Amino acid sequence: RSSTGFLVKQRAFLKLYMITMTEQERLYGLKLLKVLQSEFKEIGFKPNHTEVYRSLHELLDDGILKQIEVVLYQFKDYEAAKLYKKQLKVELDRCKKLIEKALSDNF
Amino acid sequence: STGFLVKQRAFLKLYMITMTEQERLYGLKLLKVLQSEFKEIGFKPNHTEVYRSLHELLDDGILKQIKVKKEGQEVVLYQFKDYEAAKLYKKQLKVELDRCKKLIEKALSDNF
């Protein structure tokens, strides 16, 4: 039920960024979708509404984030979050390695 | 071949084409073979994935099947059928891979 299959759940990926935006205090439920799409327009990945907001609601659900004048998000359980980023760093490295293996193996 | 990150099936096929370039896409061993490449990187492909990939490459016509055998019988080896299309695909996937590697590089430097 965690963050893979093959490469890395797009929702893991997104969750990563949301934490990194929660530290930095810039995690506003406002133009969220717009920001995220703006972060990545260039490597041609356009995260859709549903995916962004499932990433977001899952983090409230795992008690990682909390809601607060629009809506801002702070850490409910920053501990769980801290460790969670460290789970992604490993996932992303594995992923980096796998692409590189493919690159070197096939070219 | 994509959308977020590269499709597992596309990824598999690329290997399959290279293995064919290396004159070693064998019928028999196959699934064991692949799972063996990617163990040690936490990717273990399943039967459906690998055979759907192999079968697409035939249906689309990149590969033809052959019979051959070496000592101790006949045995199945996969060969190119439209190697030019096989070549295109490798070029397509390069572009795709380079992107994924970029996307992961952004992630790593954006959050750590």
User: Where would I find the H helices in chain B?
Assistant: 8-21, 31-38, 47-59, 83-111
In sequence order, which residues have a C-beta less than 8 Å from that of residue B100 and are 6 or more positions away? A7, A99, B5, B6
3-state secondary structure of B76: strand
Specify which residues A12 forms β-bridges with. Answer: none
Burial class (CB in 10 A: 0-12, 13-18, 19+), A98: buried
Distances (CA, A) of A65 to A77, A79, A83: 7, 11, 14
Q: Which two tokens stand for residue B74?
A: 């006949």
Q: Is B109 on the interface with A (CB under 8 A)?
A: no
Residue A59 carries which DSSP code? H
State the helix-helix crossing angle for A10-22 and A78-106, rounded to 10 degrees: 130
Q: Judged by CB atoms within 8 Å, which residues 25-84 of A form the interface with B?
A: 39-40, 43-45, 47
Neighbours of B24 (CB within 10 A): 12
Beta strands in chain A (DSSP E): 65-67, 73-75
User: Does the beta-carbon distance from B111 to A45 stay under 8 Å?
Assistant: no
Q: Is B97 on the interface with A (CB under 8 A)?
A: yes
User: Does the beta-carbon distance from B112 to A19 stay under 8 Å?
Assistant: no
Cα separation, A12 vs A2, whole angstroms? 8
Q: Burial code of B27-59, b = ≥16 C-beta within 10 A, e = fewer?
A: eeebeeebeebbeeeebebeeebbeebbebbee
Which resolution in angstroms does this entry have? 3.0
User: Does the beta-carbon distance from A99 to B102 stay under 8 Å?
Assistant: no
Sheet holding B76-80, edge to edge: B25-26, B76-80, B63-67
Specify the experimental method: X-ray
Cα separation, B73 vs A60, whole angstroms? 62
Q: Of all helices (H) and strands (E), which one includes residue B64? A: strand B63-67
Identify all chain B residues contacting A105, using CB atoms and an 8 Å cutoff. 15, 18, 37
What CATH class does A1-107 carry? mainly alpha
Cα separation, B54 vs B4, whole angstroms? 23
- The CATH architecture of the domain made up of B1-112 is Orthogonal Bundle (1.10)
